[PDB]
Amino acid sequence: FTLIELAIVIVIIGILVAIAVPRFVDLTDQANQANVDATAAAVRSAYAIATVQAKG
Amino acid sequence: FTLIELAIVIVIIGILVAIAVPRFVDLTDQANQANVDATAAAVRSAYAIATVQAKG
């Protein structure tokens, strides 16, 4: 590579770095809560259906 | 140096010059645009992650 091409590369690397980038976040607490809540809704419906099946 | 060696040098200098050589170019506009775009992608993801953290 010519010295000019290396100079251009040295410039552009410095500009394509120094972007923002997102953090990874452990969102499993919020997702676990929604899983527990959705499951609780399912248990209530499953119970209601069971009261008809059981006739009691 | 002998006169022959100087004559040879006078010939070869004239041929190793008269190559092409690249121009340096201010490519910072294109690089800045890519930085802004990559940063915009990061802001969208950071916002999406924040809507889960905020629960709203």
Side-chain angles (χ1 to χ4, degrees):
Chain A
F1 311 125
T2 64
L3 188 51
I4 297 294
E5 179 175 358
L6 299 169
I8 294 282
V9 163
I10 286 161
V11 166
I12 294 174
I13 290 165
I15 299 168
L16 298 192
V17 177
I19 58 164
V21 63
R23 298 177 199 277
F24 188 92
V25 174
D26 182 6
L27 298 173
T28 63
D29 286 345
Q30 293 84 359
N32 283 336
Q33 183 59 47
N35 179 295
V36 164
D37 289 331
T39 300
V43 173
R44 285 171 162 167
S45 300
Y47 177 93
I49 296 161
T51 67
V52 182
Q53 292 177 309
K55 206 189 277 178
Chain B
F1 311 125
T2 64
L3 188 51
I4 295 295
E5 179 175 357
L6 299 169
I8 295 281
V9 163
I10 286 161
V11 167
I12 294 174
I13 290 165
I15 299 168
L16 298 192
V17 177
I19 58 164
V21 63
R23 299 184 200 279
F24 188 91
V25 174
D26 182 6
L27 297 175
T28 63
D29 286 345
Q30 293 84 358
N32 283 336
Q33 183 59 47
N35 179 295
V36 164
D37 289 331
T39 300
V43 173
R44 285 171 164 164
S45 300
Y47 177 93
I49 296 161
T51 67
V52 182
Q53 292 177 310
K55 206 190 278 175

